[model samples]
Target: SLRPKLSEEQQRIIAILLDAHHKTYDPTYSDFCQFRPPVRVNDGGGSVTLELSQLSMLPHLADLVSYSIQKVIGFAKMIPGFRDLTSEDQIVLLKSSAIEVIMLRSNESFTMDDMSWTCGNQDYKYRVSDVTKAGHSLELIEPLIKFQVGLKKLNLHEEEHVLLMAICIVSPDRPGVQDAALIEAIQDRLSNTLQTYIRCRHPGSHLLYAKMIQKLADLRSLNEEHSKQYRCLSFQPECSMKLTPLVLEVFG
Candidate 1:
């Protein structure tokens, strides 16, 4: 009942974050597959390997990723100070950071033991094998899995997780952002709130705060590697055609 450290406005920001984040994805919810990845099981009675036949899963996965990406865009709209940017810059920020935030938001579905994402009521699972066949090398896939594994270990409460995502979206360094000063100010505010929230909510561990921010930095590399792979994938018209309009718009 007593959250004395946060001011009223800070509380408002967190509430909006919690609301928008729930709209993004909540593990408690069962509606993960509005766009379902095709179901196929390996005959080895084991779990993992990416054969070309599995390529059909790409379009569905693209649509599914686009679903999450679109929700992230919506979630950014609710972040305080996000609406202040020019619409052009808004698109740029979202375009640049969408994957990062989705990965952050997706920690819920990441199954650490077998290292796969469970979706479609556990009907479809995505593992590094599938991603490799999806046209990515272990170079990107390994770090992505590593990032998810590291992030999940943080055991973030919804509040902390949501704020970290908001902070990630406001980065001013993204290409084509015209208003770096304004964006940085907003980012700083969100960063401060996250640091404060951690201090008050977690207590006695500045290391946790440091590690959390570090993960945001880690996401930057993952985003870069991802875009690089996407760039390569785009050169193949066959591959490009299967991606949804939204997916192409955001990442193509």
Candidate 2:
């Protein structure tokens, strides 16, 4: 109902909770697949092993999403049309467009509170977002919806506000491993599952988002050495250098 902001204590608690949760929970194949190593290399032929690591060491989801928004904003500045706009206009457009992106891609109607799994009578809850709503058209509003949805979710973490009251409702019987490989596997499965649902629900918006994703990929490669950081983060131990969009823009 009101403009969102996070207090210092709220931020600290988030960091503490995530850190503690990572320690308490066992790593799983799903996590490994989803959160790949930051570095990778080619051996003799085609196979590769990226420099994946423990989830605790990886950047927080909230931080990563924030970085992504900034990255997109920075990218827009380089574009002829977006660049020509006034700073205020650019910010307004970006905020609206990003929200549209999320709404178009949201796979489920579940909200953050409803992110749970259930087996028998027990219930468990996890972090999830619901982007679909009436009067929201994928073609005209994908980016803005997605951006709004994501930002709101991140804000909830910062404020320690549990708006969604539903439990995950899932059973603990599902064994979750902590190995790097397992983590990557789980991430891949879950991400794809979500994305596939999104694409099917809104094919037109999905195509547009796909193009944007490719551009983002290209932007990453241009800044960093593609051969070195094609599939993972460039800050890994094996990586020779860290690359950001600004770093690449300097050379050009």
Candidate 3:
């Protein structure tokens, strides 16, 4: 099938969304994965221990995760039609899709060589085992790593990343949405624009569009696994780090 051509209005919308994405995700503006200097505490003897290195680094990890969620919300508001939705609808969409955006945003921190994720400072590294120690099951990490690796292989452009984030936010399936049809209509427009943009950008790479859409499913699975990990961590007595209120309300 031939790809549809975008109208001038559609192009304008795309440009605006892309600009908002860049503003929110530009490394200088938002470094969600940047490491704070590790907290030091007395080890109860004669020595000091880094606090973040304990309890699976849950404190610092929670802080990073909270920052990413706020970034997603900020980016969503920047979408052209997003603010038109009722407040309830906005929260519904955000709650449902925030984790997926975070997963994409954190891709910048993933390193294939060690199969680990690092903060911007590069000194703090988190491996699968480290997360598992924080109460997540050992089984979830492999598929999460696979998803991250697959996304890295795509080498997505800034425009594609921003558009996909928009698509994820305007999803129609989020429960309790006040205007499903309106959200779906917006989603259709974004999807059409995304398809046209990808085709124009990659031209003759017939499989790339399908692969990119299929990634949404992979992200969904990863988000579900992430929810399970959050549940475990939320209940663990030792992992008592306080998450940001928005993070708790959305992903709690």
Compared with the true structure, all predictions reach lDDT values of 0.80, 0.30, 0.73
Q: What TM-score, computed on C-alpha atoms, does each candidate reach? A: 0.88, 0.22, 0.84
- Whose lDDT is greatest here? 1
Superposition TM-score, candidate 3 onto the true structure: 0.84
Inter-residue clash pairs, candidate 1:
none
Query: In model 3, which runs have C-alpha deviations exceeding 4 angstroms?
Result: 1-5, 28-54, 204-206, 238-240
CA error at residue 187 for candidate 1, angstroms? 1.0
lDDT of 3 by residue, 37-156 (tens): 333233333111232235434555667667778778898998878988999899889999998988877677787887887754444567665554444554577887888899888888
User: Which residues of candidate 1, in runs, are more than 4 Å off?
Assistant: 1-4, 26-33, 36-54
**Predicted candidate 1 versus true structure: per-residue lDDT over 36-91, tens digit per residue:** 55544352322223433344557766876877887888899999999999999899
Worst 10 residues of 2 by lDDT: 162-171
Global Cα RMSD, each model: 3.5, 22.9, 4.8
